[PDB]
Amino acid sequence: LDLPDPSLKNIIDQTTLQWVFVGGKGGVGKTTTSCCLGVQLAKSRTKVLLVSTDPAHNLSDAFCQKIGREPTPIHGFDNLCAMEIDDVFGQMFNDLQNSIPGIDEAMSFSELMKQVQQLDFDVVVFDTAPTGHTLRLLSFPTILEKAFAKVWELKDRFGGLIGQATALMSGGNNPAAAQEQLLGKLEETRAVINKVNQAFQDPTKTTFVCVCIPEFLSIYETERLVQELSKYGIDSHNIVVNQVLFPEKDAEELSAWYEANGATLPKEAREICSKLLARKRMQDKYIGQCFDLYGDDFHVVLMPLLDYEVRGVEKLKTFSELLVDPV
Amino acid sequence: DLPDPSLKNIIDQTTLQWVFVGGKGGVGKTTTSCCLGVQLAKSRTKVLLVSTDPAHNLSDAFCQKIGREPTPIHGFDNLCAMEIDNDVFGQMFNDLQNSIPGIDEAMSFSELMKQVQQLDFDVVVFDTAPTGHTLRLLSFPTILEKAFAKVWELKDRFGGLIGQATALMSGGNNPAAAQEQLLGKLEETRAVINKVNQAFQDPTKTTFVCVCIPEFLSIYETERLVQELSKYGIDSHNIVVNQVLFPEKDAEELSAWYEANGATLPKEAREICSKLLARKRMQDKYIGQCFDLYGDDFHVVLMPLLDYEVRGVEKLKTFSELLVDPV
């Protein structure tokens, strides 16, 4: 068969990329794959930044180095930085936060995008939260529009009280001035997120990498994420199937060898081979399902399951080579 | 001519089963709720107080540790208080929580309502969270319907994948059985909340008490809450304006005395009198605004601002006496 290369080398080749997002369900290796992509991009690119919106501090444990809320240069690299992210006006803002769930996340994302675009980097890798939170990250514009419409509805409906009280309170508690400031903050956030989305819908600058493992839940969340990215016009052409058991041998070669030499093995080795072969068959079924869903338009990169955790700078550097050009 | 400036209509309506107390933070929701409970303990055979306020303000109010389950109030025979704080099914539930924000609060409220309705009390007073969270509490049926529609949409879209994986996995990890179990849990929650909401729209059984203070923000949140209760068919006819400065005299007497003897007071007495007069003028303006918005259809109960915090059983008894039969 002729298919796209089973590696993430196309990410390194496309030198015009500015946003590289890495998504997937929790526990599939999002942080490790993101760190390896950052390590690989640090070679060709002048400046590379890694941004983690995962609530935990998995970036610090991954790089075996304390990573701050601001850019922290990665030990052993000259151009690789990391970053981990966790009164009338005030009352109206709290009413808006309570009425429209997700507006605070939208404003936090807007502030983060402004800070990152002002940090001036050539490429930013994005270790996102699990799929569920990334879907809200993608649905942010509808939340901003609902916030605008909620503010307008509140103004229209309570204009009588707002104007009658505007006469009373003085100084910096005018309900109309505070309401206009809330509208202006919503407008700032919406403009920032609109420019960011215009940059995101350009496959020249933005792409998405989906990480999964040969199990039902991971592939299901990967399909959810792919369909949502397709809906919102965000490009994705890389699926990383991690923790693959023995990505070199087939289930058939070793199954035949075992069927030919079954009675020659001790009880223990025979049980271990049988368990390993069964898990390999299940993983092969799920990899075939992946190749059915994708493969035509996606680079499917298979990564071997390792005994040790891929932590530390040197181990990550060695694993990135397995990521970008396999055996 | 106006309705009686007291909450005595709450005690008179013997058919009431749910008495909700809402308002902005710091206006005295907990104090008013505890006083209403103390007063209902006289006429009713058994009275329960339920606090959904995130903090543990009930314990500080009663000056006594109140548990997560009903704890009989010291010194009362019929007054109890209460303060309220891989896996395929879990993954689908998390997808629902991420897609529909507020479904977990809806299920928690359903469990709380089932527990309270099984505790069997004659009347339950409900110290709710600040206004925004009560407004979220009111939209629960729509949120449950949106959750149902999300589960059905996911079922329709991914039925092929779900059945194809059902063919594979064994035992109690069927994705289709898990989806049906999620639907059944949603149905349980929706039935409980439907019974509760049918009970809420009956003025025979449910009424709302709005607590506020003579300031703009409190009156604005009170108006929001009243309009939302009107939209959602929940009855409210009691506004409690708490922390009123000097509820006995009018704006004229002390102002006239001071303007006749202004230059005769020492610096300290003159400063305190001036601050008091300004506070009284502002409070009178906002109380007039309250009487403009309501009074025609609402019992407006004015409560005096006290130097001490209304903690302890005796202070609660005196504040309840000022609440149900004023001076």
From TrEMBL, chain A:
An annotated Gene Ontology molecular function: ATP binding
UniProt keyword annotation of Cytoplasm present: yes
Binding annotation for Mg(2+): T31, D54, D127
Family named by the database record: Belongs to the arsA ATPase family.
Catalytic residues as annotated in Swiss-Prot or TrEMBL: D54
Species per Swiss-Prot/TrEMBL record: Phaeodactylum tricornutum (strain CCAP 1055/1)
Main location: cytoplasm
HAMAP family: Asna1_Get3
EC number: 3.6.-.-
Compartment(s) of residence: Cytoplasm; Endoplasmic reticulum
Residue stretches making up the ArsA/GET3 Anion-transporting ATPase-like domain: 18-324
Binding sites annotated in the UniProt record for ADP: G27, V28, G29, K30, T31, T32, N242, P304, L306, V310
Alphabetical keyword list: ATP-binding, Cytoplasm, Endoplasmic reticulum, Hydrolase, Metal-binding, Nucleotide-binding, Transport
Keyword Hydrolase: yes
Cited function: ATPase required for the post-translational delivery of tail-anchored (TA) proteins to the endoplasmic reticulum. Recognizes and selectively binds the transmembrane domain of TA proteins in the cytosol. This complex then targets to the endoplasmic reticulum by membrane-bound receptors, where the tail-anchored protein is released for insertion. This process is regulated by ATP binding and hydrolysis. ATP binding drives the homodimer towards the closed dimer state, facilitating recognition of newly synthesized TA membrane proteins. ATP hydrolysis is required for insertion.
Residues annotated for ATP binding in this entry: K25, G26, G27, V28, G29, K30, T31, T32, E215, N242
Coiled coil location: none
Pfam family, one: ArsA_ATPase
GO annotation, cellular component aspect: GET complex
GO process terms (BP): tail-anchored membrane protein insertion into ER membrane
Quaternary structure (record): Homodimer.
Name under which the protein is recorded: ATPase ASNA1 homolog
UniProtKB/TrEMBL annotation, chain B:
Stored Pfam families: ArsA_ATPase
InterPro entries assigned: ArsA/GET3_ATPase-like, ATPase_ArsA/GET3, ATPase_ArsA/GET3_euk, P-loop_NTPase
EC nos: 3.6.-.-
Compartments where located: Cytoplasm; Endoplasmic reticulum
Active site residues of this protein: D53
Segments forming domain ArsA/GET3 Anion-transporting ATPase-like: 17-324
Residues that hold ATP according to the record: K24, G25, G26, V27, G28, K29, T30, T31, E215, N242
Protein family (similarity comment): Belongs to the arsA ATPase family.
Protein name stated in the entry: ATPase ASNA1 homolog
